[PDB]
A and B are shown apart, each in its own frame.
With several copies, the nearest count.
Chain A
Amino acid sequence: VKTAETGYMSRRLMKSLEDLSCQYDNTVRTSANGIVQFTYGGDGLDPLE
């Protein structure tokens, strides 16, 4: 069952959040330049770091 349903939520959320990227003024925006977060996580910090 898991191998059948692997990468389902991944694909769905990919369609939801695919175009969001951090901007050079520390904002997260859609491809339509609409603000989703004025700063990432309210912190600006990368979870990878």
Chain B
Amino acid sequence: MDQENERNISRLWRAFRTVKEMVKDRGYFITQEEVELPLEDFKAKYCDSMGRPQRKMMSFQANPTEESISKFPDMGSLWVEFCDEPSVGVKTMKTFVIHIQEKNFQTGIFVYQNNITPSAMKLVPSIPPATIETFNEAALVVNITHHELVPKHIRLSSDEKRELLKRYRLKESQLPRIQRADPVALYLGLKRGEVVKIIRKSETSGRYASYRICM
């Protein structure tokens, strides 16, 4: 079969682009050159002569930018590792967790192909210095932040959150809430208590801003 191979090649290329954009707006040095990658170029790099897409050397490390680090000082490198099994196992999870911990990354992105084990719910939280965000390769085929229905969510620094809660004289419990595992809270890597500013657009009130806090 070649149709299934071509389809998987295109889908993985689109997912790689989605992760590139998601790293770019989560704030890291990723440029339009390595974001815009044609399907032929992606095949020329991340494939073998049989055409089966490899998910080993596609993994890349990105680092925060000067503007991003100026906003958030305690942000470090990002390491995103792809998996290559229908359901992944306990051993590879330990390998990647130890890899992240020893390379001293503030967080790591785990992208699996089809599904993950139930025992993985217990192992992924146990990492004090870092955090591991797990996706589904399908769940980042097309990024949700480019949809016409999704308005611009913007992560606010601690200082910006303090000013907001002071300008409105609020406490965090009074802000509107955005859930954890909200498809945009995951894309932006929001943590509990983080405040995001939503630039939403109406028809009879132009462009205005709302806010939500992650619970």
CB–CB under 8 A between A and B in the complex? yes
Partner-B contacts on A (CB < 8 A): 25, 27, 29, 33-39, 41-43, 45
Known: A25-B168, A27-B168. A35 touches B174 (CB 8 A): yes
The stretch that binds A, out of B119-127, B178-186, B198-206, is: B198-206
Cβ contact within 8 Å between A42 and B174: no
**Interchain Cβ contacts under 8 Å between A and B, 29 examples:** A25-B168, A25-B169, A27-B168, A29-B174, A33-B174, A34-B173, A34-B174, A34-B176, A35-B168, A35-B170, A35-B174, A35-B175, A35-B176, A36-B176, A37-B210, A38-B209, A38-B210, A38-B211, A39-B208, A41-B202, A41-B205, A42-B205, A42-B206, A42-B208, A42-B210, A43-B205, A43-B206, A43-B208, A45-B205
**Minimal Cβ-Cβ distance residue in B for A33:** B174
Q: Give every chain A residue within 8 A of B200 (Cβ-Cβ).
A: 42
Partner-A contacts on B (CB < 8 A): 168-170, 173-176, 200, 202, 204-206, 208-211
Chain B nearest CB, measured from A36 CB (Å): 7
Residue pairs across A and B with CB atoms within 8 Å: the count is 35
Chain A nearest CB, measured from B173 CB (Å): 8
Best-buried of A25, A41, A42 by chain B (most CB within 10 Å) = A42
**Minimal Cβ-Cβ distance residue in A for B164:** A38
Q: Give every chain B residue within 8 A of A43 (Cβ-Cβ).
A: 202, 204-206, 208
Q: Give every chain A residue within 8 A of B209 (Cβ-Cβ).
A: 38
Give me 15 other A-B pairs in contact (C-beta within 8 A), A41-B202, A42-B200, A42-B202 excluded: A25-B168, A27-B168, A35-B170, A35-B174, A35-B175, A35-B176, A38-B209, A38-B210, A38-B211, A42-B206, A42-B208, A42-B210, A43-B202, A43-B208, A45-B205
